[PDB]
């Protein structure tokens, strides 16, 4: 479970960029007295799955072994019009080719 | 029924994600007297019910006894890019493959 | 007529929440000086007419007779993602299919 | 003409809904010195040639002499998606068989 | 070049309206020094060239010597629905037929 | 890697239109103290590689070492539907053919 102001109940705003919930995150771990370790692979664990399932799975789709700068990258294109563009394009065509899903 | 300021009146705005929503539930939940175990099931009842379309629905995707942090986790990610992109996949393969719905 | 103030100029913005219209429409209302009898229809005959096309339409839908707290939920289906959602699955599979219309 | 803050200078902000529009326009009208019945000419021509292009050529589609409840009826549904989707329901209907525009 | 605060750097906003921007436009322009006649080249030069490709380009598509109220006219149709409405739908069509372009 | 308050963190929003997001840029190239060649070349490579994917890749689209003028008219169309659109059209023209991608 995850309570308010812990970094457990921190979750990316769909529309939050992930540059910003990104930082959302670790300042609000500022805000969590845990240890570093307790801390960092929070910002890990946390972070990734806690990162709006837009960020969250692009983080997935940036391969795991990623670095938070990449994952910024492809997660900040969330927001603008860069999203609402090519995310409308890949879903647009997702189900183009994909439309058989099983 | 449901009168104002009551976990009953309270609801998922229509945009409002689950981790908000669950919020002011919650506290407004706090502003109702009801027991715990009058309480913390409306916190079941209520919020799955009351938690807009989008979560809850999703909600009874996820399988009777979803962790609250399950749906904590999926009904949040609507929104934004939450809901315009991962439903842009489903919507579009909804009229594509499911134009015909009967 | 219908001049500003009354029940008569009481309309859902069209993203509007429903459960906000719906909100203004009453206190509105209460402003408004008709008798229970003339107060309450209002809640019924305008709050379907003056509800935002789509919650209109949606009303129609919900099959007269429903509560309202059937429509207040629907229609409550617009503004966030859901409307577009909702519809975005409907007039694309109608401008599909049904796209001759006559 | 049409400077600011007078009546011809009241334009419908292209998402302001009409419902914004019109109370704005009335805001501005009557803000505006022109005669009682200057007011009412105004109240006329302007209010449909300002209203947004949208709502405007709405008040213009519901047919001149179209009481302005129907212009309420419909301008009403602009700004939100319900617009953005009624409008594609046509527009995107208008394109498939209508593309072909001379 | 141009510098910050100059109308040289006034340009609208890629979703500001022209209504806005070409208040700011000139609201800067006094801002900046320029002489009545250097102003009133700048408020037809500047105006179009840093007026958003979208009103930039309708300016053009009035045809020059437009007046003043026609960009405002059919400028500011851009910005809401209006805009991403007419503009889909143009677009929508222009890759129907004139995916072709060279 | 560039940390906080730098202008190698400064990123144009999904939102910050390049115009503005160049303007937060070069207050925040000021507020990190660095030598002249270093703000002379920090506003080159920290304000494409950081420019939203969008303007950045704009940049690059314009062709790299473009004027200030090229990336920022086609940066500056980079915010709104004119963006959203012109874009939308495109990419949903580069998913109609281009789909494939290999
Ligand atoms: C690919 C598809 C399957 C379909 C096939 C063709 C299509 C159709 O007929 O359905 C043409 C219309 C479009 C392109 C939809 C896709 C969806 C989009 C969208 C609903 C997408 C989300 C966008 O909003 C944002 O990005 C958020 C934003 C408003 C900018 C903010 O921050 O406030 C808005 C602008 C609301 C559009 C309007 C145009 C349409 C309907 C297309
Ligand atoms: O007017 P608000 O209630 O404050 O809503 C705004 C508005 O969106 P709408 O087009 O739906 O009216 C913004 O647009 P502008 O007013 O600047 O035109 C938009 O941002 P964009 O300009 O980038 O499209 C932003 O949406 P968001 O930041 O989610 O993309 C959204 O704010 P909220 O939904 O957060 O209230």
């Not at 939050?16 to 805000?31: G, I, Q, S, W």
């Not at 890990?44 to 983080?59: F, G, R, Y």
Request: charge should be neutral.
């Amino acid at each position: 479970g995850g309570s308010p102001t812990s970094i457990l109940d921190i979750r990316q705003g769909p529309k939050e960029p992930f540059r910003d919930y990104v930082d959302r995150f670790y300042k609000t771990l500022r805000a969590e007295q845990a240890s570093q370790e307790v801390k960092n692979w929070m910002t890990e664990t946390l972070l990734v799955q806690n990162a709006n399932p837009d960020c969250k799975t692009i983080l997935k789709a940036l391969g795991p072994g990623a670095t938070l700068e990449e994952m910024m990258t492809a997660c900040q294109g969330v927001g603008g019009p860069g999203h609402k563009a090519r995310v409308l394009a890949e879903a647009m065509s997702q189900v183009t080719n994909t439309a058989t899903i099983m």
